[PDB]
Symmetry: C5
Subunit: 366 residues, 5 copies
C-alpha cells in the first residue's frame, strides 16, 4: 500500500503483475530501454553488435550472463502478459542469436581451452545457452533452434553420464554448483518440450551436492568444488547459494524450502528498523556484497522465487534508491548502478514468475 522514498513501484504491485495480466509501468520502461532506440538498445538486432554492453561498460566475460538473465526475465514477461508474449519471443530469438557470437563465448578460446565452446566442459556458457534454447521454444513454439537444442542437450547428458561426480565442470578441476543448476534445469525444459526423461539425472545431483558441497547447518554452499584434487574452497558464498536455491526450487521445491530459512540466518542482515536488508557474501564478516558483489541482487531473486515479499521489499529498498532510477521518455535508466548485472538482475527479480512456472508455461496461441 505504501511506497518507500526511492522505489518505483510497490512489492505488492510486482507480485500482482501476473494476476492483472500486465507488467508495471517501470518494468515496461525497462523493456523500452531493452528494445526502443535504434542500434544502441541491447535487443535491437540479432547481429553481432554489442554497443549496448559497451555503453554500460560490461566486462567481456560477463556479457554471457547479462544476456542469460535478460532471457530469463523475458520468459516470465511472456507468462505474465499475454499481450507481450510475442515481443518476449522476438527478444529471446535475438538473445539466443547474440549468445552465439564469438564476442560472447570467445574468452574460452582466449584462455587456451579450444575453438569449440560447447564440445566439452564450459558448462558456465553452454548451460545458459541450452536453457535459453528451451525458454525460446516454450515461448514462441518456433523450431528454429530445435536441432541445436537437441544437440547441446545430448552433449550435456553424455557429459553427466560420464563423470564420476554428478554434474559437469566449467574448466578441468573447476566445479560450480550454480552453473550445474542451470544445466539440470535445461534438461527439465527439454523434457517439457519433448517426451524425454533427461531430468532423471537430477536426483543423483541433488544427493551429490547435499552430502558433499553444502553446509546443512548454515544452509549455504561452498564457493566451488575441485574433483581432480578432491578440494572444496572453504568459504561459503551467499551469491552462490541464493542462485542455486532459486533454480533448484523449480525442480525440487522441498530441497530449497529446507535450506532457505537457515540461509537467511547465515547471510541476510536486516536493518533500518526492518525496512531494509543487505546480504553478506561470506561468513566471518559484517561487510555486505563482497566478492563479485551480487549477494543482495541474487538474494532478491531467491526471495521472489521463494515468495518472500517481506525480504524482497527489504532488499529492493536497499538496492534501488541509491542507484537513482529515472524514467525519461518512458524508458528506464539507473544513474548509479550498484553492481555488475544491475538492471538485468533487478529486471529479472521484478517479473520473475518462478522457475517452476516457466517449466509449466502454456503453449502459444498457435
Amino acid at each position: 500500500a505504501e511506497l518507500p522514498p526511492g522505489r518505483l513501484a510497490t512489492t505488492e504491485d510486482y507480485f500482482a503483475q501476473q494476476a492483472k495480466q500486465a507488467v508495471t509501468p517501470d518494468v515496461m520502461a525497462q523493456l523500452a530501454y531493452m528494445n526502443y532506440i535504434d542500434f544502441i538498445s541491447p535487443f535491437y538486432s540479432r547481429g553481432c553488435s554489442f554497443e549496448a554492453w559497451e555503453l554500460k561498460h560490461t566486462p567481456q566475460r560477463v556479457i554471457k550472463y547479462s544476456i542469460a538473465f535478460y532471457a530469463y526475465g523475458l520468459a516470465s514477461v511472456a507468462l505474465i502478459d499475454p499481450k507481450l508474449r510475442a515481443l518476449a519471443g522476438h527478444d529471446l530469438d535475438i538473445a539466443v542469436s547474440k549468445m552465439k557470437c564469438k564476442r560472447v563465448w570467445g574468452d574460452w578460446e582466449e584462455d587456451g581451452f579450444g575453438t569449440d565452446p560447447i564440445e566439452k566442459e564450459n558448462i558456465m556458457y553452454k548451460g545458459h545457452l541450452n536453457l535459453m534454447y528451451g525458454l525460446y521454444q516454450l515461448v514462441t513454439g518456433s523450431r528454429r533452434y530445435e536441432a541445436e537444442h537437441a544437440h547441446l542437450t545430448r552433449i550435456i547428458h553424455d557429459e553427466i553420464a560420464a563423470n564420476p561426480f554428478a554434474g559437469i565442470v566449467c574448466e578441468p578441476d573447476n566445479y560450480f554448483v550454480q552453473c550445474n543448476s542451470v544445466a539440470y534445469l535445461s534438461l527439465w525444459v527439454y523434457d517439457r518440450l519433448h517426451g524425454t526423461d533427461y531430468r532423471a539425472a537430477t536426483r543423483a545431483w541433488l544427493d551429490f551436492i547435499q552430502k558433499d558441497l553444502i553446509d546443512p547447518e548454515r544452509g549455504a554452499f561452498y564457493l566451488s568444488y575441485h574433483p581432480e584434487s578432491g578440494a572444496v574452497k572453504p568459504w561459503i558464498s551467499a551469491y552462490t547459494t541464493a542462485w542455486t536455491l532459486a533454480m533448484v526450487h523449480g525442480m525440487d521445491p522441498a530441497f530449497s524450502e529446507r535450506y532457505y530459512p537457515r540461509f537467511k540466518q547465515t547471510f541476510v542482515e536486516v536493518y533500518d528498523e526492518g525496512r531494509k536488508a543487505r546480504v553478506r557474501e561470506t561468513a566471518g564478516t559484517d561487510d555486505a556484497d563482497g566478492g563479485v558483489g551480487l549477494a543482495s541482487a541474487f538474494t532478491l531473486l531467491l526471495a521472489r522465487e521463494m515468495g518472500d515479499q517481506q525480504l524482497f521489499d527489504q532488499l529492493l529498498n536497499h538496492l534501488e534508491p541509491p542507484a537513482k532510477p529515472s524514467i525519461v521518455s518512458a524508458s528506464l535508466r539507473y544513474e548509479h548502478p550498484g553492481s555488475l548485472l544491475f538492471d538485468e538482475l533487478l529486471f529479472l527479480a521484478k517479473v520473475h514468475a518462478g522457475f517452476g512456472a516457466l517449466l509449466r508455461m502454456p503453449p502459444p496461441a498457435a
Copy 2:
C-alpha cells in the same frame, strides 16, 4: 512577416522559394558549407573521404542517412532554382559515389550479415541508395548509374514479390515501415524514368501497413514489426510516423491526409503562446525528442510536405535558435546542433518541395 532571434528567414520565405525560383540566402549559405572549402566540405570529392563527417562526429551507422537526406534536399534545390540545377546535379553525383564507399555500408558486414549490402534485405541502406540513383537521373538526365538502378530496383521488386507480407525487412525478422516507404517511393521514380509499373506493389503495402502496423485512432505507426514472430513492438513512434507519412504523401496523398490531424494530437506539443512546438517520441511521456532524438526534426519535414506552415514555423522556432546559427564568410554553421543529422534535416525541411513534386519533376535539357 516577423523574424525571432536565431531565425534566418521567415517561414513564408521558405515556402515561397519555388514561386520565386530562388533559394533563400541561408539555404545558399548551407550550400556553401556543403561545397566551398577544399578537402573538408562534404561534397568536395567523389572519393571515399569523410573528413566532413568526422569533423561533425557523425556515428558511422548514420552517414548513410546523412548522405541520403542531403541528396533528397538537393533534388528540391534542383526543382526550386534552375540556376543551381547543374550544381545540384554535381552534388547528387558525388552523393551517390560516397554512398557506395565501404565506410558507409560496412556496418552490414561487421554485424555478420554478409559481404553484399544489396543482395538480400538491408533495405534501410539499399532503399535510400535506390532512390538516390533515380533522383540523380531525374535531375541530370545522366545514365551514369542507370544499370545499377535497374539492378537494385529489380532486386527490390523481386524481394517484395517473394515475401508473404508486403515489403522487405532490414535484418532477418526486423521490418521497418519508414525504410519500406523509401523503397516503395523509389519504385515510382523508376516508373517515371522508364515505362515500368513496378509501383503496382504500392496498393498491397498501403493496405498491409494500414491493417497491421498503424493505430488508426491515434494516427501513429508502431516502432517496428517482426514477421517471423508476428510481433509488433508496442510503442508508437513519432519519428517513424512523421517520416512514413511524409513519404506516403507523395504516393497516396489521401492516406497521409487521413492520419495527419490525429498524428499531431498524439505527438506534437505547442508551447510559448503558440510560437514554438516540440514533439514526443512515443506515447505516455511529455518529454520531447526521446529515442533517437529526431521526432521534432522529422515532424518539421512532414509539416513541409503537408503544407502546414503554422506547425513548421513553431518547430523551427524550437529547433534553430538554440542551435546558434551563424553565417561566416557566406557559409552556414551551427554552434550547438540539437540532434544527429541536424544541418541535413533542417536543410531538407527548408527546401523540400514535396515528394510528389520530385516524382513529377520536369526533365532536364540535352
Copy 3:
C-alpha cells in the same frame, strides 16, 4: 624606410634583394630553419622523413603544397643571391625527392582513385611536381630528373590535347584553374630548357578561362568548374584568383594586368589609415580570410608578382605582426602562425622574383 612593430625587415629591403644580390637577414634565418637542425628541419634529408611537418601539425593533404611553395621560393633565392645558388639547388633536389614519397601523394590512393599518382588527372599534385622538376634543372644545370621531367611534360601535354575543355582535372569532374596554371607554367619551363613549343597550348587555355571561368567585371574566378555536369560553383574565390593571376602574369602579363585592379576592388580591404590590408575570400561577406584561410597570403604573393609595393606592405603588416616572429639562435620562428602554409607563403612572398624572371633565369655557367 620605417619598420612597424612585429615586422622583421622593410618592404623596400625585400624588393631590393635582387639588386643588392643578397637576401635579408630574416630570409636567411628562414633558410636556417629550413636547413639547420639535424633530422627535424624540412630540408635535412632526401629520405621519406617528415618530422618537420609533423612538428608543425601540417595536414597530410597539404604537405605537397608546403614542399612546392618552398621550392618556388628557393628558385627565387637562387636568382637573388649567387652565393646561395648552390644551397638552393641542394634544397630543390631534396624537395623533388620528398615530393615523390607516398606520404605526400598517397591521399590519391586512400581516396580510391588509384595507385598511380601521375598517370591521369591529379593535376593538383603532378602539376607542382612538374614545375619543380624544371625549376631544379634551371637552378642547378643537373639532368638528374630530366627523364622524369620529359615523361610528365608529355603526360600533361597529351591530357590537354584530349580534353574538349582547355586544361586537366584533379578528380573526375573537378576542374581547378589555379592547379591548371601551375601545369601550364611548367610547359614554359620545359620549353625554356629544351627547344620545344609545348607552351603553345596556353593561348587556348587563357581564351577558355577568360570566357567561362572568370567574372570579368569583378576580376575574380569562380571557385571551380565541373565539366561533366557543366557546372561552375557560383562563388568567386579570392585565393583562387590571386594564385591564378600570379602565375599567369609570368606567361601573359597583359592578362593579369587587365584584372588586377578589379581583383583589388572586389576583395582587398585597406584599413588602419592605409597601413594594413586583409582580403575577403568571397563576395557577400565582411569576413577576411574565410574558406581555406589563404586569401591574404596569396594576395601578398600576387602583389609581389605585380610589383605593388604598397599593397605588399599593407598585407604584410596584417599577416606578420600577429604571428609574433622571433629570431632565436639565428633561426626564424613564428609563435602564432595565422593559417596553413604560413612560413612557406611568407617565405615565397619575401624572395619572389616573378615567375617570368624565373623562366628567363641565367644558367649556372
Copy 4:
C-alpha cells in the same frame, strides 16, 4: 605476544602456525584474495588469463616470479594445515599451468633469444617452473606433470655438466647465483621424488660460488658473473644474497648459517629503538631498498628460513603497517604496497616452513 601497531598478527603466531596445524586469520584472508572472486582472483582458472596481475600492474617480466613465490607459499600451507592441503594442491596445479602461458615466458622470445624458453639457458624461468613441478607432486602425489618434470630436470642437469663454470646462465653471458639456487633446489626435489642423485652437482656449485661470487667477510654475493669475459659486477647485492642464502639453507644449512650474521651486519639497519629494520640493497649507501626494491622483503624470507624471529618482527613492523592492510569480506588487501611482489613475498614469509621442510614433506594420507 604483544601486537605492534598496524600489524595483523604477532610474529609468535606466524611461527606457531605449523605447531597449531592452522594458518592465522590474515593468512586465510590472503588465500581468499588468491581464490575467492570469479575471473579476477589470481588462482581462479588454469587458463591463460591474467586479470589479477593486470589489476595489480605487475610488469610482464615479473609475472613469472609472482606465480613462483605464490607457489612456494602454497607448498608451506600444505604442511601447515592438512585441512588446506587439497586446496593448496589445486592452486599449485593452476600455478604451473599458468606458468607455461606465453604471457609469462614470452619476454625470452621478444628479446630475440629464441622461441623455446627451456631449450638453452633462461634458468631464471625454467628453474622456477621445474621446482614448481616437483612441489606440486610433493603436495598432491599426482604424476600429472611427472613427464615434464623429468624432461626439464634432465635439461637442467645436462646443461650443468656441459659448463666449465658451475651452473647455468640466464641470458647469454649473464650468470645469476640466485637463479641457479632455484634450479639446484629442484634437483633435490627430483631426487626426493625418485631415487636419483642429481643433487650431487650441488657440491661443485657451492664451492664455485664460494670462491668466486661471494665476498666472504661481508657475507654477500656480487650482483652477477659473466663467464665469457670473466667479469664480476663490482657491487654486492642484498636482495641477491637474501634469496640465495635462503634457498641454499635448504640444501646445505651450514653454508647459510656461516654467512647470515655477516650478511646482517653488512646490509640490515635496525631503527626505532630496535622495533624496526630496513635493508640496504648494496654497500656504500644508507638508502634502503634501492635497485629492484626487494632487499627488505627477501630478508624477511631469510629471517623466516633462519628462524630469526627478532629480525622477522623488525622487518614486518617496517613493511606491513605502511602498506595499510585491511580485511574486507574476509579477504586481504593492501592499500599502498611498497614494492613489486609485495603481497606475494609477505604471504610467503608468513607461512614459510623452510625449504628443507618442503624437500622432506610427507605424502598425503593418515
Copy 5:
C-alpha cells in the same frame, strides 16, 4: 672554489682518476646506473631490449649515438681503472651487440635508403659501429667481432678510395665532417690492432677539410658539405666543430691545437665571475646551445681532450647543477637533464683519457 651546489667532484679529481688508477665515486655511480637494476638498466643484457632508452625518452634516431658515446667512455674506464677493465669489456660487448639491432639502425630502412645499413654511405651509423668493434678488441683482446671489424673496415676504406672528395657521405649529397672523423679514427684502431696502414688516407682528409670545410679565421667548421651540388651550408656549428676537433686531436694533435683558441673566441661565453661557461651553437647570436642543443656538452668533451681544465670546470658548472644530480643507493640520476644524450656525454667527458691515449691502450695480456 670548493664544491659548488650541484657538482659531485672537483675537476682536479676527474683529471686525476688515471693517476690514482680509480674512478671517482660519481663515475662509479654512473656505471651503477648503467649496470645495476635488472631489465631496465641500459647494459643489463645483450638482447634487443631498450627499456632504458624508452624510460629516458631517447628519440630512436639518437639511440645509436647514445650507445656509441657510452662505449667511448667505457674505453677510457678500461684505461683508467684496471680493476674495472673486465666490467668495461663486458659492457662494450653489450654495446656492440645492441648497436646491431634493427631498432638502432632501422631509420635507414624507414627513410627508404635500403635494407643494408653498412653497404654504402650511412657513415653516421657504420662509422661508430666500426670504432666500437676496434675499441672492444683493444679492451678485451677478444676476436669475437674481428671478422666483422675487417669487413666494415674494408667497406669504409674502399668507399674513401672511390670518392673524388676525401671521405664518405651519410646520404647522397650529405657530407658531415664529424661523422667522417669517427670513421678515420676507426682506421687508426684497426692499424693498432693489426699491422695495416689504413690510416694513410687521413692526410688527404685533413688537407681537404682544412681547405674547404673550415673557416680558418674563426676556427669553425660549416654545418655540412654537399659534393654533388658543390654546396656548403653557410652556418658554422659549435657542436660540429667541438666534436671534430676532439677526435682529430687523437690523430693529428697539431691540427686541433691550432684551431682551438679561435674556436673558444668564436663560440665560448664565460660568465658568472669566471666560474661558468656556455657555448653559442652558431655565429650571429648570443643564445647558447641552439640547434641540436649539444654545443656546450661537446665542448666539455673537447676541453677534456685538450687538457683545458679551466674551461672544463666552467662548462661543468653550467651543465650539471641545473640537471639536479643525486646519488640514490650508490647510483647516479639526473632529475632535469638539459639536452639529449645528457648522462652519456657528461659520463664520457668525466672519464675521457684522450683519443690518442685510447689508440695507444695497452693489452690485458
